[PDB]
Amino acid sequence: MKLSKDTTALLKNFATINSGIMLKSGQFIMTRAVNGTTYAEANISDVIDFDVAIYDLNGFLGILSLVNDDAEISQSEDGNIKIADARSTIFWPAADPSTVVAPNKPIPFPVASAVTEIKAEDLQQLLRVSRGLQIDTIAITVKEGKIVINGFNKVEDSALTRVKYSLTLGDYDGENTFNFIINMANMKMQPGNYKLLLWAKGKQGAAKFEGEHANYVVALEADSTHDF
Amino acid sequence: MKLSKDTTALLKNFATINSGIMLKSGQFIMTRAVNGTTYAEANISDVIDFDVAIYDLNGFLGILSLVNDDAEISQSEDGNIKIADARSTIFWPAADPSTVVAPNKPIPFPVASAVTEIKAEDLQQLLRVSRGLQIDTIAITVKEGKIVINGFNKVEDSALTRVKYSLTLGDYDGENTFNFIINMANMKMQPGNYKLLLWAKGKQGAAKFEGEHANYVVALEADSTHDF
Amino acid sequence: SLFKDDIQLNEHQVAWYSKDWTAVQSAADSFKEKAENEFFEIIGAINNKTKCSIAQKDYSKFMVENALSQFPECMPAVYAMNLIGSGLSDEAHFNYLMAAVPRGKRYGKWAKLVEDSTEVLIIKLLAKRYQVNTNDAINYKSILTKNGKLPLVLKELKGLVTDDFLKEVTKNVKEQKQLKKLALEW
Amino acid sequence: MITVNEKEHILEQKYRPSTIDECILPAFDKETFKSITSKGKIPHIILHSPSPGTGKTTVAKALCHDVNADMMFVNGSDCKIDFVRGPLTNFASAASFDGRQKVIVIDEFDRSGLAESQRHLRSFMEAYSSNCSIIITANNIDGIIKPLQSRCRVITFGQPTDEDKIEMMKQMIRRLTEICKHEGIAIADMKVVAALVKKNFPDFRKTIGELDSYSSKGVLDAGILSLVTNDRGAIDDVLESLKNKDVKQLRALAPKYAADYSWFVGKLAEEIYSRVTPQSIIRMYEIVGENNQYHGIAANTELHLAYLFIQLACEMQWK
Amino acid sequence: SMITVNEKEHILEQKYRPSTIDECILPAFDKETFKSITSKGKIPHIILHSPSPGTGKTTVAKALCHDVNADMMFVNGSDCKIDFVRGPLTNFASAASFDGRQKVIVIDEFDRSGLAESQRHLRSFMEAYSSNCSIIITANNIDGIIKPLQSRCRVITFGQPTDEDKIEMMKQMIRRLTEICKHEGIAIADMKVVAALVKKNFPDFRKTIGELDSYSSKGVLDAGILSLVTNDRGAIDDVLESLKNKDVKQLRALAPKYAADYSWFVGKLAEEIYSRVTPQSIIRMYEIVGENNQYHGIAANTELHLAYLFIQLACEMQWK
Amino acid sequence: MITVNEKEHILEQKYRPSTIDECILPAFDKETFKSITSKGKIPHIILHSPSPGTGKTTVAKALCHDVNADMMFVNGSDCKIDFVRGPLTNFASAASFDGRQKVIVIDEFDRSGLAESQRHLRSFMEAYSSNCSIIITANNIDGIIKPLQSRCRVITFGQPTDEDKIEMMKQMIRRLTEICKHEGIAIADMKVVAALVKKNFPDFRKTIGELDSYSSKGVLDAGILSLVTNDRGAIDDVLESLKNKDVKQLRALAPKYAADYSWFVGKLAEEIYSRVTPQSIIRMYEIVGENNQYHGIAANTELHLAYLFIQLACEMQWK
Amino acid sequence: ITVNEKEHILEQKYRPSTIDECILPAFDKETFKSITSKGKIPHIILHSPSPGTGKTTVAKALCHDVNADMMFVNGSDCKIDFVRGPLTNFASAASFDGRQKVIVIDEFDRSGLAESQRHLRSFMEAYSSNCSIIITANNIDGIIKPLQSRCRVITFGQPTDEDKIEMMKQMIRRLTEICKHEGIAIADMKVVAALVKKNFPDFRKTIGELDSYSSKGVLAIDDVLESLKNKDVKQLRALAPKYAADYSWFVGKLAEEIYSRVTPQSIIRMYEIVGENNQYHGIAANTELHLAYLFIQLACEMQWK
DNA sequence: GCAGACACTACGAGTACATA
DNA sequence: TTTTTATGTACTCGTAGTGTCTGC
Ligand SMILES: Nc1ncnc2c1ncn2[C@@H]1O[C@H](COP(=O)(O)OP(=O)(O)O)[C@@H](O)[C@H]1O
Ligand SMILES: [Mg+2]
Ligand SMILES: [Mg+2]
Ligand SMILES: [Mg+2]
Ligand SMILES: [Mg+2]
């Protein structure tokens, strides 16, 4: 089995979520962070033909730039990972699953409390600004029949008192009202257009981005507030 | 005497092999470590015009990047040195030969048990795999008729068993068997094409790296194994 | 210097408002002022038999032992916590000293030797070239005056004075008076 | 009267005082804080304990609350030089638009590796002194560089006078009582409340934290009093057998505490110190110190402990 | 059964690691204070410390979480440096569990010295995030936990039972060992050896099970194993007699015999002489043996050091 | 049967035992190792002597060999905390792809400055207990922190029963005999082989190292036997210089016998006993006993011997 | 005879070159020959404790005879990071003429190094195939027990009455030869026989002496000894840290040198005082202080002649 | 396309703690 | 009123140097 540029750019992403990863045969791959805060699922171009656990993902992906863009890969007789090149050949330590915090399966997403969508054009401007504005967290609430988004500076701010930023997403059809806060840090998604799925059963509560490539879930913040 | 842009770079390089050096008149430099592990010779196109000993090399090449490039490095009027500049003059100490370990042995590599070449871009790939794939020893030998390299991990893989890396270097035609092992630590060349001449009879021996900008010769580790 | 009316903005205000940090830094470096300790109110209490009770303040078994190490009236007690004290609570090592060393006074000056900085460099040198430890090295220098003329050998070794080596001898620009000093009169 | 935060279960943080009056402090200290909140402007201040939970970081937030400051609260260990250059310079230079004293609270700023940040701060404090002031909180002063103590009013905590201690304790008892009414905790014996206060005196946090753990049963009765005044491990059986100079008993206790020696030997020093005469102290350190010192050469550790006991039995003259 | 078995482990003091707070063998008041805690449904900041190893600190930490059904991150103390607290733990502590679970961070074996910097950083953290999540610290030595973190916690101190607890806890541990043997295929010939293993290393329940593995080589625990567990391999008569008689050539000859294993011999001698000599000879005999034992291991010739002990006792002992 | 490594000339390392059976050990110890290799999985173990060359680090490699583990062997002193974090964590987390027990042998781990690494290891051992186990080898236990002894089966060496000693010695004699056949060493008197074994008993390394040095002449005859059992000489020059109470001579003899002290001190007790009056005997044990006792704290051993001579010279009344 | 002509100190430029040139006990010389014969060198310890018996000379000679590739190292320079770094390099590297590699660690006694020595115990077994170690020590107890286990411990100093008479002749011949080379005039042969006899066991000092005669080419402890006589303290208090550096040697010199300078029942007192101090060194935590305490004790109780 | 600018690493400074 | 041992190990900070990759 081989992997292409597009695939890897993903896993270099999935690295920033969990420095390890467990993956098996299929065109599906996934990781969730050790601490229970985020998670991503992926359908991909290239095809997996055997189960394997990688301890150091962020650097395996690295080793992979150290040979041609085509070298074939497989499970060695040596039950490790064989990256074989035209001239050379590498043998990457496949780790014991015990130690790679992976998700057993895939949990469905509660038919969403609230729905709206976000242009990738739009989301680039959020990240873009946030560096510029020291925006460390955000909140998505309802201002006048439309779904807005507000960036803050939890550092200087403390209470999320003053808004430093405010995109304006969709409109709000239904009639609840809420404030879902999100740790910017917890937002690890390769840019591109998303459908947004919010959810809460009181103290329960999460947020799902639905890409064209993969789906992402991040935890709300401790006092995300709402009437669901 | 004046020292060029290319000469000084084989001088920072001979510092990685000896704190001190002794080059003498001629167009030849050579040094080898206080522990007799590592020998390096190089023929420069700046003609050294006298016999000098420096307790420290990597100290000297420092007071030399500052001075402009006229640098009539002459000999001081009291046994020490004079770096003549476009517009200044500096004085470095000059050590009694009793305080520098100098090779003194331009012994000639006997004859090659076998010869083979290595491409510079492919020293590249190995000098770098080993860094993050964690290699610290390698072994040059014959696999399927060509002469290969294996990288291992002396600590994790205590007896050179699991090969973390292989590299193929163009066939061997002679009919011998061998396994020459080198401790990566004692390998210090700036990249480039290199002729590889390896000699050994019975148990005593060494490997000689011919390069167009320097020559390098180091010692097989304890266990290397052959039939020459 | 235009405008010609500026209630002078203090060295700091300029550093910051203008936001070049390198000037802000040297303004920082301004007060480095390094000194600390108050370990002599602890020594003092052990001596004068006032009350401190320790616990709150940092304590140094090395510093308290050495300070007292001065006055022979104490040596018996320090001698004790020296053999035995390794392995006692700082709370303890203190409580003990309170109940042993009896009188009280001491005045300041410790005894530190006088280093001829030159003589030390010379022995440190000889022990280097000759792979001997310091006592033979001293023998060598005694010997090497009385024949074989120390200039002969200091001239050979002036070779390695490497300024890494000087940092091992003294701690200040006294250290640069020495680079020159054996580069000279041999 | 009592502020409750209600977003916290942890209960020493539920009852964290909102204002400078709700705080239990030495007389002169409270008065100096009232004085400050009166003048309406807040100088650069350092509050330090070194005994934890005396209320430093609580009074920090209260001072701000009383003068109605615009306050940034900051973890000390998070406040590195780039933070001061960055976020703090912004805040300190920006103008609060209600005309509020701006105040930067740096909590637990006594870490060693921040000295570089602290120096950088010394120049800052003079540049921005017109806008905003800084309140530093520290457990150990020597971790605050001298030029920062020069620039501040250093107020020093939990080291009350003999009278303050007696008043502060009454005040803390009244408070605990009030916390009990609110919490549904029944007080059967007031003596146990006076005991919890006295036990952990300087530290008001642990004194409340205790109340949570002895409330398992919703009541404080004479039976809880036994556990509050009582000593759960102790040394008593040895200390007593030592005084009595008996041996079979000492011979028998040896194997008990041989289990973990380094700890036991420690307690014994601490506990005997109080119970024996002045030149018995000097002897007891020589005896215990020597015994501790060779432990780990000595082959039978249980015997080595017996040897220590016989030694102390004979030579200890007990007050 | 009444017992959790992990089955992913062969190592067997880790196979039988207790799942819940009840399966844990603890002092009465301690178990009760943990039930009390799991009852209120929320977990405060806690420190568990022995200093004796294997009292169950890091086991009870995981159980507490299990009982309250917390979302728990478990962390090696020595891995928890200040950049960890800033990065992953701050993330976890600020993130909201979605199933309204107490979030808990278990830092195991946090008493290392070079982490003081991290610990201080944590002191301000614990108050900021106290609403979401609590911290359970496990330590062998308290003094390695800075004072302001002890202020912030309920410090529970282990392996320090009452005299009754010890007697009950020992019975409980004997019943448990018995049960582990049924499961393991270990035959118990003499129950006295199981009571001996427990008593031998009491506070430490880990070593007490670890022992069982090593004395099970032969799949049975019989009176013969009991000799190695208590093990005395000792009859002292020839020395005791040569001592009374105050003769020396004999003492001089017996020295090399018992020099073989000293720490045991010295032990029997104390035990056996105690009964055979007068009351103020007892106090002298501890001073003499104690001192001799103390310096053994500095003393270069061990056989001579034994001879020296005999001469000393021969003269100063007055035999009842 | 005997394993020979043949890459080594040094000959106490040529004959290093390959498997648990080739090892000469106490009965119960061998049996407990067989038991372990049987169950096929290896627990966390500590092997300690403190007498060198009892076979600790040999049996470590053998245990691995018998269970066919994937084993990383590691110098204890090289085992700092960043090593455990980096290479060992890698190895312990990686899965061996033949389904082999993974085992990390840390040899000679009893150094003092590694306590920090050992603590770090205490949490590691429970995390990775499923994959892989650790075998620690130590000369002095007190250099292994308590919580690591808790986590291990501590097996203690070179402390056989009286019967084991008698069997082990026979086994070692057979072995030496076999080594001699292989090496071309002629055995003229079997009594010298039994002597070498008995002489340094616990230590099997030195017992083989000796054989190299007495083989200069390729034969072991009655003449070598004299040097093996032999001498250290009589003591006469000292015993005489002692009676005469002279010093310069005593001062001069000190360095001579400082060479091997434990033997000398032993002869001195034995020989003086006969030569001095009855209450000089009791004094001579107190003087020699005390001197022997502190040797090894005493820094200059030659001086310590002089000190002994001066003491005896004065207090000995001679017959 | 053997001369290293570039050496300006007498002891460095005359050292016997080979095992035969060395003056030794019979069995000792024979055991060294035996060794050089087998062509390979085991791990060895050479120790006196009497200085100048030839330990560090025989070390270099053994190497010379077997034609080893030898790194020579000052003991006090060999700390754990040296063994990890350069020595591990050397011991793992293969000499390319097939020479025994040997590491000579000279004067390895001080237990400042115990940590290094332990580190070495695992090392010696790992690279025992390449290279061996020769340790030189004045005092054995400064060499940890497990290193003595790994070595052949050869001990100096018990010459027979005949050896003494021959060795002295040999040393006189040698001194004579050194004098020819050095330009030192011998007017009276009796003085040469006197220097040899005077410090007999110690051949180093016996050559070092000859240099002292050097100024006309024909034939220390003071600062402490003085401060002791004067019974002053601030000076004694100051000298302590100086000699705390290596204690076992200093204490040795102090015994040797005071013996001569003090009254007869002051000698008996001085051994009781120094002996007891030496005895507890190494329990005593602060070694500089322990030296101070020794000074105070001697100042008061010593009666100088 | 290349600068710009970002993200990462290596190093030196100061602090610390256990041993001797 | 006085003022810091030597070796080895571990950890945090700031900064400078190093390298890979993207917007106008
Ligand atoms: N056996 C010997 N024969 C000749 N010279 C000797 C002998 N032993 C020592 N020396 C002299 O001592 C010097 C070297 O001393 P060294 O071997 O270091 O003594 P030590 O090991 O006792 O310190 C040389 O200069 C040498 O001349
Ligand atoms: Mg606080
Ligand atoms: Mg644990
Ligand atoms: Mg070993
Ligand atoms: Mg020497």
Got the DSSP string for B116-135?
Answer: EEE-HHHHHHHHHHHHHTT-
Q: Which residues pair with A89 in a beta bridge?
A: A84, B166
In whole angstroms, give the CA distance from residue E213 to residue E210: 5
Structure tokens at E198: 């427990």
A146 contacts A168 by C-beta, under 8 angstroms: yes
Q: Which residues of B33-44 are buried (b: 16+ CB within 10 A; e: fewer)?
A: bebbbbbbbbeb
CA-to-CA separations, G101 to E115, G32, G67, in angstroms, rounded: 44, 18, 9
A3 contacts A61 by C-beta, under 8 angstroms: no
CB atoms within 10 A of CB F201: 18
Atom of ligand 1 nearest to the CA of G174: 4
G111 CA to centre of ligand 4 in angstroms: 20
The DSSP line for A45-113 is EEEE-S-EEES-HHHHHHHHHTS-S--EEEE-SSSSEEEE-SS-EEEE-PBPGGGS---SS-PPP-S-S
In whole angstroms, give the CA distance from residue G248 to residue G235: 21
Residues near F97 by Cβ (< 8 Å), separated by ≥ 6? A76, A78, A79, A80, A94
Q: Which of A142, A183, D58 is nearest to E132 (CA)?
A: A183
Structure tokens at A155: 């550092």
E153 contacts D209 by C-beta, under 8 angstroms: yes
Q: Is the CB of G16 under 6 A from ligand 1?
A: yes
3-state secondary structure of A218: strand
F317 is an annotated ligand-binding site residue: no
Structure tokens at F315: 């207090």
Q: Which residues of F85-99 are buried (b: 16+ CB within 10 A; e: fewer)?
A: bebbbbbbbbbbbee
G104 CA to centre of ligand 5 in angstroms: 11
Give alpha helix (H) positions in chain E: 28-40, 57-68, 82-84, 90-94, 116-128, 147-151, 163-184, 191-200, 205-214, 223-229, 237-244, 249-259, 262-276, 279-295, 302-316
F239 contacts F272 by C-beta, under 8 angstroms: yes
The tokens 């709150």 sit on which residue? C56
List the single protein residue with the shortest CA to C1' distance from H19: F112
Q: Which of D30, D102, D88 is nearest to D59 (CA)?
A: D30
User: Phi and psi dihedrals of C157, rounded to 5?
Assistant: -85, -10
Domain with C43, as residue range(s), is 35-112
Task: Let me know if G122 is exposed, middle or buried by CB neighbors in 10 A (0-12, 13-18, 19+).
Answer: buried
F152 CA to centre of ligand 3 in angstroms: 13
Domain with A210, as residue range(s), is 2-228
Q: Which residues of E97-136 are buried (b: 16+ CB within 10 A; e: fewer)?
A: bbeebbbbbbbbbbbbeebebbbbbbbbbbbebbbbbbbb
Ordered structural domains, chain G, with CATH: 1-160 (3.40.50.300), 161-219 (1.10.8.60), 220-305 (1.20.272.10)
Structure tokens at E72: 């728990």
CA F102 to chain centre: 28
Query: Which protein residue has the closest C-alpha to ligand 1 atom 18?
Result: G56
Q: Same domain, yes or no, for C91 and C123?
A: no
CB–CB of A204 and E99 under 8 A? yes
Q: Same domain, yes or no, for C105 and C54?
A: yes
Q: Name residues 65-104 of chain F with a Cβ under 7 Å from nucleic strand I.
A: 77, 80-82
* Closest chain F residue to the Cα of E207, Cα to Cα: F150
Structure tokens at F193: 């082989």
Residues near G99 by Cβ (< 8 Å), separated by ≥ 6? B204, G67, G68, G69
What order do you get walking across the sheet with B29-32 strand by strand? B29-32, B38-42, B215-218, B204-211, B194-201, B114-118
**How far away is chain F from the Cα of A92, in angstroms, using its nearest Cα?**
11
Q: Which of E240, E264, E252 is nearest to E317 (CA)?
A: E240
The tokens 């006197």 sit on which residue? G194
In whole angstroms, give the CA distance from residue A80 to residue A74: 8
CA-to-CA separations, D63 to D42, D105, F306, in angstroms, rounded: 8, 10, 74
D173 contacts D129 by C-beta, under 8 angstroms: no
A204 contacts A169 by C-beta, under 8 angstroms: no
Name the helix (H) or strand (E) containing B15.
Answer: none
In whole angstroms, give the CA distance from residue A167 to residue A147: 9
CB atoms within 10 A of CB F12: 24
In whole angstroms, give the CA distance from residue D305 to residue D299: 11
F89 contacts F124 by C-beta, under 8 angstroms: yes
Tell whether G122 lies on the interface with B, counting CB pairs under 8 A. Answer: no
Q: Which residues of C113-146 are buried (b: 16+ CB within 10 A; e: fewer)?
A: eeeebeeebbbebbbbbbbbbbbbbbbbbebbee
In whole angstroms, give the CA distance from residue G253 to residue B196: 59
In whole angstroms, give the CA distance from residue A196 to residue A209: 5
In whole angstroms, give the CA distance from residue A134 to residue B197: 59
Structure tokens at B215: 């020559």
F266 is an annotated ligand-binding site residue: no
Interface test with D, best of C14, C16, C57, C59 (most D CBs within 10 A): C16
What order do you get walking across the sheet with E103-108 strand by strand? E71-76, E103-108, E133-139, E46-49, E154-157
G102 contacts G68 by C-beta, under 8 angstroms: yes
CB atoms within 10 A of CB B105: 10
In whole angstroms, give the CA distance from residue F16 to residue C19: 71
Largest pairwise CA distance in chain F: 79
Cis peptide before F87 (omega within 30 of 0): no
What order do you get walking across the sheet with B165-171 strand by strand? A72-75, A81-84, A89-92, B165-171, B146-152, B137-143, B178-183, B225-226
Going D234 to D239 to D244 to D250, the CA torsion angle's sign is positive
Structure tokens at C140: 């060598």
In whole angstroms, give the CA distance from residue D245 to residue D252: 13
Q: Which of F188, B200, C78, E246 is nearest to G284 (CA)?
A: C78
Cis peptide before A106 (omega within 30 of 0): no
The radius of gyration computed from the CA coordinates of chain F, to the nearest angstrom, equals: 24
Q: From its phi and psi, is residue E291 left (phi > 0), alpha (psi between -120 and 50) or beta?
A: alpha
Q: Which of E236, F220, F295, D121 is nearest to G281 (CA)?
A: F295
- β-pairing, F153-156 vs G69-74, is unpaired
CB–CB of C89 and D50 under 8 A? no
Residue C86 Cβ under 7 A from any strand H atom: yes
In whole angstroms, give the CA distance from residue C13 to residue A183: 36
In whole angstroms, give the CA distance from residue A9 to residue A6: 5
Q: Is the CB of G51 under 6 A from ligand 1?
A: yes
The tokens 């695939």 sit on which residue? A7
F253 CA to centre of ligand 4 in angstroms: 36
Structure tokens at D49: 């304990």
CA-to-CA separations, E311 to C143, E51, E253, E259, F309, in angstroms, rounded: 54, 40, 12, 15, 21
Residues near D184 by Cβ (< 8 Å), separated by ≥ 6? D218
Give pairs for F214-220: CB < 8 Å, separation 24+.
F215/F183, F215/F185, F216/G30, F216/G31, F216/G34, F217/G34, F218/F184, F218/F185, F218/F186, F219/F185, F219/F186, F219/F187, F219/F188, F220/F180, F220/F185, F220/F186, F220/F187, F220/F188, F220/F189, F220/F192, F220/F193
Largest pairwise CA distance in chain E: 83
Going E158 to E162 to E165 to E171, the CA torsion angle's sign is positive
Ligand 1 pocket, mutate which of G9, G15, G46, G154 (most atoms under 8 A from CB)? G15
CB atoms within 10 A of CB B65: 8
Query: Which protein residue has the closest C-alpha to ligand 1 atom 20?
Result: G52
CA-to-CA separations, A51 to A15, A91, A105, B162, in angstroms, rounded: 18, 16, 14, 21
- β-pairing, A89-92 vs B165-171, is antiparallel
- Which experimental technique did the depositors report for determining this structure? X-ray
CB–CB of B134 and F87 under 8 A? yes
In whole angstroms, give the CA distance from residue E290 to residue D308: 8
CB–CB of A93 and F128 under 8 A? no
F4 contacts F182 by C-beta, under 8 angstroms: yes
Residues 146-165 of F with CB under 8 A from A: none
CATH code, A45: 3.70.10.10
The DSSP line for chain C is --SS--PPPPHHHHHHHTT-HHHHHHHHHTT--------HHHHHHHHH------SSS---HHHHHHHHTTSTTTHHHHHHHHHTTTTS-HHHHHHHHHHHS-S----S----PPP-HHHHHHHHHHHHHTT--HHHHHHHHHHHHSSS-THHHHHHHTT---HHHHTTT-SSTHHHHHHHHTTT--
3-state secondary structure of B31: strand
The DSSP line for D122-161 is HHHHHHSTTTEEEEEEES-GGGS-HHHHHTSEEEE-S---
CB atoms within 10 A of CB B126: 21
User: Phi and psi dihedrals of D140, rounded to 5?
Assistant: -120, 115
User: Phi and psi dihedrals of C51, rounded to 5?
Assistant: -120, 125
In whole angstroms, give the CA distance from residue D207 to residue D190: 15
Residues near A204 by Cβ (< 8 Å), separated by ≥ 6? E98, E99, E100
Residue G187 Cβ under 7 A from any strand H atom: no
The tokens 């289990």 sit on which residue? D259
CA F251 to chain centre: 33
Amino acid at D177: T
- β-pairing, D70-75 vs B81-84, is unpaired
Going G237 to G238 to G239 to G245, the CA torsion angle's sign is positive
- β-pairing, D45-48 vs D153-156, is parallel
Count of alpha carbons within 13 Å of F113, Cβ hemisphere only?
11
Going G253 to G254 to G255 to G257, the CA torsion angle's sign is positive
User: What resolution, expressed in A, was reported for this entry?
Assistant: 3.3
Residue E84 Cβ under 7 A from any strand I atom: no
CB atoms within 10 A of CB D61: 21
Residue F142 Cβ under 7 A from any strand I atom: no
CB–CB of E91 and A185 under 8 A? yes
Q: Which of A83, A106, A105 is nearest to A94 (CA)?
A: A83
3-state secondary structure of B81: strand
The DSSP line for F159-196 is ---HHHHHHHHHHHHHHHHHHHHHHT-EES-HHHHHHH
DSSP code of residue D112? G
- β-pairing, D153-156 vs D132-138, is unpaired
Q: Which residues pair with D71 in a beta bridge?
A: D103
3-state secondary structure of A181: strand
F56 CA to centre of ligand 4 in angstroms: 6
D211 contacts D181 by C-beta, under 8 angstroms: no
3-state SS string for chain G: CCCCCCCCCHHHHCCCCCCCCCCCCHHHHHHHHHHHHHCCCCCEEEECCCCCCCHHHHHHHHHHHHCCEEEEEEHHHCCHHHHHHHHHHHHHECCCCCCCEEEEEECCCCHHHHHHHHHHHHHHHHCCCCEEEEEEECCHHHCCHHHHHCCEEEECCCCCHHHHHHHHHHHHHHHHHHHHHHCCECCCHHHHHHHHHHCCCCHHHHHHHHHHHHHCCECCCHHHHHHHHCCCCHHHHHHHHHHHCCHHHHHHHHHHHHHHHECHHHHHHHHHHHHHHHHHCCCCCCHHHHHHHHHHHHHHHCCEC
Chains touching E, CB cut-off 8 Å, 3+ pairs: A, D, F
A198 contacts A180 by C-beta, under 8 angstroms: yes
Give pairs for F167-176: CB < 8 Å, separation 24+.
F167/F27, F168/F24, F168/F25, F168/F26, F169/F194, F169/F197, F169/F198, F169/F201, F171/F24, F172/F24, F172/F197, F172/F204, F172/F207, F173/F197, F175/F2, F175/F15, F175/F24, F176/F207, F176/F208, F176/F211
E10 contacts F39 by C-beta, under 8 angstroms: yes
CA G72 to chain centre: 15
CA F7 to chain centre: 24
3-state secondary structure of A149: strand
Torsion angle of C-alpha atoms F123, F124, F129, F132, degrees rounded to 10 = -160
User: Phi and psi dihedrals of G66, rounded to 5?
Assistant: -90, -5
Q: Is the CB of G150 under 6 A from ligand 1?
A: no
C149 contacts C156 by C-beta, under 8 angstroms: no
Q: How many domains does chain B have?
A: 1
3-state secondary structure of A197: strand
Residue C107 Cβ under 7 A from any strand I atom: yes
Query: Which protein residue has the closest C-alpha to ligand 1 atom 27?
Result: G15
Q: Which residues pair with B178 in a beta bridge?
A: B226
Q: Name residues 191-250 of chain G with a Cβ under 7 Å from nucleic strand I.
A: 241
CATH code, C95: 1.20.272.50
Structure tokens at G101: 């590699």
Query: Which protein residue has the closest C-alpha to ligand 1 atom 8?
Result: G54
3-state secondary structure of A44: strand
Q: From its phi and psi, is residue E95 left (phi > 0), alpha (psi between -120 and 50) or beta?
A: beta
In whole angstroms, give the CA distance from residue C146 to residue A90: 68
Q: Which of D113, D110, D91, D94 is nearest to D148 (CA)?
A: D110
